[PDB]
Amino acid sequence: IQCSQRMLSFSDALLSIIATVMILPVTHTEIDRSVQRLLATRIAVYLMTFLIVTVAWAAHTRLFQVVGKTDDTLALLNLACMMTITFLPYTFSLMVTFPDVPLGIFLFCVCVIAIGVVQALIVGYAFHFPHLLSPQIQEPLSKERVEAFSDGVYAIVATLLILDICEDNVPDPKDVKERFSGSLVAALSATGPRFLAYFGSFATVGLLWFAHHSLFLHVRKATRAMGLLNTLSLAFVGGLPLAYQQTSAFARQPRDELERVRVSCTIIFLASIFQLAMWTTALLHQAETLQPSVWFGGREHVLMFAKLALYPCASLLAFASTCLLSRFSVGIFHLMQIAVPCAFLLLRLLVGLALATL
């Protein structure tokens, strides 16, 4: 018998890697009609493979909620399960790209059966040894597994763009001599747009997590509904690097710039509206879901509501500005990107002043 905490922590460390695998082809597309069609299908494949893996992760979370502890043999079998799930993103992509060929669906079916067989072995082993079962066995989701998966997914998504910078955007000496007259600074400057995208992408996904971090500190017990929205929250957060990378790219006409800013704001709203939904959904059954410091009329109630609702409000103002002003919108988008971090920093005083004003 062994404590299962770490074995699972590693388990979600792999899944977050696998779930977000298909985002990499999305962000690596190079910038028209054919590109748009290609970009759409890549995005569609990403969302599908994210949910499929998430269901497999969900089954694992439930499966190991029964097996309270772990031993040497189960750890080996657990690895075989994870080794089995790592094929879903590839197998699915083959299936969609090849709907006519029956081989594609067969591989997809084989993989799903393989995951089931390994899990069937895992549960069988546990029953054969009652001391490996949870005391209850000897709806709610485990909170740690939701936390650990979320932390991973954000870390990959936050740092996607830099990994591309560290690899493909390191100047090569020969080009420096030829196309930059031997000036290193010029070579770095030509890469400046790509560096701004990373700064914005990290700041957004860096703060979106901060709202998530403070939300789940006061959550007593997650629920299936909260987990499902959380999955939808993270699914869209994966598109943020794509959004920012598009915004910083050169625009031939002002209409091109406006359209991209509309696209970028849409994903930020979708990513953070569901975090607000989780708060509201918890409020419905707050008696059994949240700490008593965030109940209706509680001390932190007003603070938490604002903290989650800032991005939904900020994004709508940016989107509304695009529709109405049509000329200062780009400045507002950049201005808000610099203002939102300040609002998060001064949230305590800002809300207190507002309460006095009201």
Ligand X SMILES: Nc1ccnc(-c2cccc(-c3cc(N)ccn3)c2)c1
Chain residues in the site for ligand X (CB under 6 A): 24, 28, 163-164, 167-168
Q: What distance lies between CA 305 and its chain's CA centroid?
A: 21
Q: Which of 141, 139, 90 is nearest to 111 (CA)?
A: 90
The answer to the question of residue 179 lying near a copy of itself (CB under 8 A) is: no
Compute the distance between CA of residue 99 and CA of residue 338 in angstroms, rounded to an integer. 46
- Residue type (1 letter), 16: S
Binding to a copy of itself by residue 113, rule CB under 8 A?
A: no
Binders of a copy of itself among residues 180 to 219 (CB under 8 A) are 184-185, 199, 202-203, 206-207, 209-210, 213-214, 216-217
- Report in angstroms how near the CB of residue 241 gets to ligand X at its nearest: 10
Is there binding between residue 73 and a copy of itself (CB under 8 A)?
yes
Residue 22 touching a copy of itself (CB under 8 A): yes
* Among the residue ranges 149-157, 222-230, 231-239, 316-324, the one whose residues contact a copy of itself (CB under 8 A): 149-157
Q: Which C-beta is closer to a copy of itself: that of 180 or that of 295?
A: 180
Give which of ligand X, a copy of itself, none residue 139 binds (C-beta under 5 to 8 Å, depending on kind): none
**What's the min distance (Å) between Cβ of 159 and ligand X?**
8
Is residue 306 within the footprint of a copy of itself (CB under 8 A)?
no
Q: Yes or no: say if 268 and 315 are a contact pair by the CB < 8 Å rule.
A: yes
- Minimum CB distance to a copy of itself, residue 198 (Å): 8
Q: How far is the CB of 164 from ligand X (least distance, A)?
A: 5
Does 147 engage in binding with a copy of itself (CB under 8 A)? yes
* 8 Å CB contact between 312 and 269: yes
Half-sphere exposure of 22 (CA within 13 A, CB side): 26
Residue environment code for 98-131, b if the CB has 16+ CB neighbours within 10 A, otherwise e: eeeeeebeebbeebbebbeebbeebeeebeeeee
Q: Which two tokens stand for residue 339?
A: 């203002």
25 is an interface residue for a copy of itself by CB under 8 A: yes
Does 285 participate in binding a copy of itself (rule CB under 8 A)? Answer: no
DSSP track, 19-67: HTTTHHHHHH----HHHHHHHHHHHHHHHHHHHHHHHHHHHHHHHHHHS
Give the residue, chosen from 14, 51, 225, 283, that forms a contact with a copy of itself under the rule CB under 8 A.
Answer: 14
Minimum distance, C-beta of residue 83 to a copy of itself, in the bound complex (Å) = 5
DSSP character for 141?
P
